[PDB]
Structures are given as C-alpha cells and as structure tokens.
Amino acid sequence: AGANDLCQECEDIVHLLTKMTKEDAFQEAIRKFLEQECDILPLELLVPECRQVLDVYLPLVIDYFQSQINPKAICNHVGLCPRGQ
C-alpha cells in the first residue's frame, strides 16, 4: 500500500516543482542556499568546483521542470512506477 503510492507521491513532488520553478524567487532562494553550501563542508569536497557545477546545472534543472512537456516521466525513470506513470 505504501509502496504502490510511491509513483503518485513522486509525481506530486514533480508537479510541485513545476509550479515552484515558475517563481524566480524560487530560483534565487535555491541558488543562494546552494552557493552557501558549496562553500562549506562536506559539499565543498564532495563536489569539486561546486560553485561552477551549480552555475551550470541549476539553470538546466530549473529549465527542465519549467519547459518539459512531461517531467513526471522522471518518476518512471527512477524506478518508482512499476505500472507506468
């Protein structure tokens, strides 16, 4: 019962992300937070060039949830939807 709800729960998270990423206040908040985390342990060592990785990939992740037609497919891709999205 719990495990069969994982697909819908994942899709609900994706739906929330698609709404939030339409707010530039969301991008700014997450950028600023991750910029601070890149500068401190453990992330500064787990991800070399953390700030450069962030500068490149955060716009791409944001754009994915903003512009993809079917971002909920992520939930099938990560294995949480054994019967399809």
8 A C-beta contact, residue 65 and residue 18: yes
- Owner of token pair 């709800």: 5
- State yes or no: residue 45 binds ligand RXY (CB under 6 A): no
For 49, phi then psi, to 5°, come to: 55, 40
- State yes or no: residue 39 binds a copy of itself (CB under 8 A): no
8 A C-beta contact, residue 17 and residue 63: no
- State yes or no: residue 54 binds ligand RXY (CB under 6 A): yes
Which of 1, 2, 42, 45 lies at the binding interface for ligand RXY (CB under 6 A)? 42
8 A C-beta contact, residue 37 and residue 24: no
Which of 41, 46, 69, 70 lies at the binding interface for a copy of itself (CB under 8 A)? 46
Which residues in this chain contact ligand RXY in the complex, by CB under 6 A?
A: 10, 13-14, 30, 34, 37-38, 42-43, 46-47, 50, 53-54, 57-58, 60-61, 64, 69, 74, 77-78
